[PDB]
Design an enzyme around this catalytic site. Sequence first.
Site, PDB file in Angstrom:
ATOM      1  N   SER A   1       0.722  -1.257  -0.151  1.00 46.42           N
ATOM      2  CA  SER A   1      -0.003  -0.274   0.048  1.00 46.42           C
ATOM      3  C   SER A   1       0.838   1.281  -0.006  1.00 46.42           C
ATOM      4  O   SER A   1       1.343   1.681  -1.075  1.00 46.42           O
ATOM      5  CB  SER A   1      -0.903  -0.106   1.025  1.00 46.42           C
TER       6      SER A   1
ATOM      7  N   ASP B   1      -0.347  -4.192  -3.673  1.00 46.75           N
ATOM      8  CA  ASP B   1      -1.676  -3.442  -3.831  1.00 46.75           C
ATOM      9  C   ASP B   1      -1.133  -1.733  -3.407  1.00 46.75           C
ATOM     10  O   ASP B   1      -1.447  -1.495  -2.373  1.00 46.75           O
ATOM     11  CB  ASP B   1      -2.541  -3.856  -2.618  1.00 46.75           C
TER      12      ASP B   1
ATOM     13  N   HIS C   1      -7.645  -5.738   0.403  1.00 45.79           N
ATOM     14  CA  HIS C   1      -6.422  -5.046   0.621  1.00 45.79           C
ATOM     15  C   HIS C   1      -5.580  -5.632   1.770  1.00 45.79           C
ATOM     16  O   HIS C   1      -4.349  -5.491   1.589  1.00 45.79           O
ATOM     17  CB  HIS C   1      -6.690  -3.430   0.854  1.00 45.79           C
TER      18      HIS C   1
HETATM   19  C1  LIG Z   1      -5.369   3.304   1.243  1.00 45.04           C
HETATM   20  C2  LIG Z   1      -5.428   4.070   2.572  1.00 45.04           C
HETATM   21  C3  LIG Z   1      -4.233   3.120   3.456  1.00 45.04           C
HETATM   22  C4  LIG Z   1      -2.789   3.281   2.821  1.00 45.04           C
HETATM   23  C5  LIG Z   1      -1.982   2.047   3.381  1.00 45.04           C
HETATM   24  O1  LIG Z   1      -0.851   2.058   3.457  1.00 45.04           O
HETATM   25  N1  LIG Z   1      -2.928   1.325   3.785  1.00 45.04           N
HETATM   26  C6  LIG Z   1      -2.809  -0.194   4.242  1.00 45.04           C
HETATM   27  C7  LIG Z   1      -2.797  -0.309   5.637  1.00 45.04           C
HETATM   28  O2  LIG Z   1      -2.427  -1.586   6.364  1.00 45.04           O
HETATM   29  C8  LIG Z   1      -2.508  -1.817   7.442  1.00 45.04           C
HETATM   30  C9  LIG Z   1      -2.628  -1.063   8.480  1.00 45.04           C
HETATM   31  C10 LIG Z   1      -2.772  -1.231   9.910  1.00 45.04           C
HETATM   32  C11 LIG Z   1      -2.266  -2.713  10.331  1.00 45.04           C
HETATM   33  F1  LIG Z   1      -2.283  -2.884  11.349  1.00 45.04           F
HETATM   34  C12 LIG Z   1      -2.294  -3.556   9.199  1.00 45.04           C
HETATM   35  C13 LIG Z   1      -1.932  -5.147   9.383  1.00 45.04           C
HETATM   36  N2  LIG Z   1      -1.771  -6.128   9.764  1.00 45.04           N
HETATM   37  C14 LIG Z   1      -2.457  -3.335   7.708  1.00 45.04           C
HETATM   38  C15 LIG Z   1      -4.511   1.667   3.543  1.00 45.04           C
HETATM   39  C16 LIG Z   1      -5.058   5.402   2.763  1.00 45.04           C
HETATM   40  C17 LIG Z   1      -6.152   6.400   2.003  1.00 45.04           C
HETATM   41  S1  LIG Z   1      -7.866   5.997   2.658  1.00 45.04           S
HETATM   42  O3  LIG Z   1      -7.585   6.623   4.125  1.00 45.04           O
HETATM   43  O4  LIG Z   1      -8.623   6.758   1.667  1.00 45.04           O
HETATM   44  C18 LIG Z   1      -7.941   4.275   2.717  1.00 45.04           C
HETATM   45  C19 LIG Z   1      -6.635   3.537   3.432  1.00 45.04           C
END
Ligand SMILES: CC1([C@@H]2CC(=O)N(CCOc3ccc(F)c(C#N)c3)C2)CCS(=O)(=O)CC1
Length: 370
Positions: free
Chosen positions: A219, A242, A297
């Site tokens: 991400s 991703d 995701h």
């Molecule tokens: C796309 C995103 C974020 C960016 C990113 O890096 N994402 C992965 C986080 O993965 C995680 C987070 C905590 C955890 F504990 C674990 C585990 N295991 C995994 C999601 C930012 C834009 S938004 O706010 O519109 C929707 C979300």
Amino acid sequence: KIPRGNGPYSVGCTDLMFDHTNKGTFLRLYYPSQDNDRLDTLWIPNKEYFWGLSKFLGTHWLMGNILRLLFGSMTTPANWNSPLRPGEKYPLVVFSHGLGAFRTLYSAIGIDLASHGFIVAAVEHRDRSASATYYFKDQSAAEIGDKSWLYLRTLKQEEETHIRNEQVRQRAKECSQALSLILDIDHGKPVKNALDLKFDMEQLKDSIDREKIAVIGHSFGGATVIQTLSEDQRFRCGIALDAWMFPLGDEVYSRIPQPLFFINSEYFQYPANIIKMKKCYSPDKERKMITIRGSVHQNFADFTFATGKIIGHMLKLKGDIDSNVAIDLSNKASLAFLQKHLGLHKDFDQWDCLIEGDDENLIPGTNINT
Ligand SMILES: CC1([C@@H]2CC(=O)N(CCOc3ccc(F)c(C#N)c3)C2)CCS(=O)(=O)CC1
Ligand SMILES: [Cl-]
Ligand code: NA
């Protein structure tokens, strides 16, 4: 349970902080080990990470205390402080975690790579994209173990473009710094780990296959891959799990000479993000993309293993696809790609067809029309 590695080598794990300051490197190391009779590795090792995850979820800080209670004793199947398996030079992956995550939360990936004979350095970023992290204010504080904590920064809508780009650039710099630290340790420089752990870093001397370096990340970490590649030619290929493309500046897209592999989930992706990925494509460059059917995701991170099937599906930690099935596909395809572009002489080419998404649970390229 987070799965054990599928590879032939047993797996060890330790933490390294050097220097002790907020500008130092902090990483979790996963590596091929001799010993298999050590205690398993504590998954989320400090209470402040749960406080961090609580802020990240936007809940009462007390939800943190409840997360701790549920997950605070959980382990991941890596032998804590095990001796490194001697007698062979190991390629190196630097791994970048997502937003609200931290260094310990991609152990399924890290353990598996290590079990196939890679050393994995999972950085902890100090850009305030981690739920929490820590460092020491000065030398005195580090000796007595007086930790200073740094928590996730919540942005206003009007900070998003600017700040996310500042963070991705810092993340890339932290990846490069981590690489230099490991290479220096390989080249025998004495390093005093700021954490007092029973793992002699001197074992790492002459243990790295110096030119076989890759960068991987989920991400925010996937954007970090891309920035890192366009900033440090020492990294020979990248794998973006991703990728969230928003943090990247318009400049970087045409500036990534290294082979790059997008492994996507089915339900996360959207046109704006795919368009940005396709902006990395040029006729002279190696680019691959696959999409794991029925995945979400969170299939790339460890919390997809931490709850039951029903609770997990409800929280979008699990998809329709089995989490072990999903991560096996991501990990095996990654190994084949790495073997191809680092020029490894292992058997990972058995999974070559997965790079092409030729499997009933893969989609070649993307399901997203643009
Ligand atoms: C796309 C995103 C974020 C960016 C990113 O890096 N994402 C992965 C986080 O993965 C995680 C987070 C905590 C955890 F504990 C674990 C585990 N295991 C995994 C999601 C930012 C834009 S938004 O706010 O519109 C929707 C979300
Ligand atoms: Cl869109
Ligand atoms: Na550089």
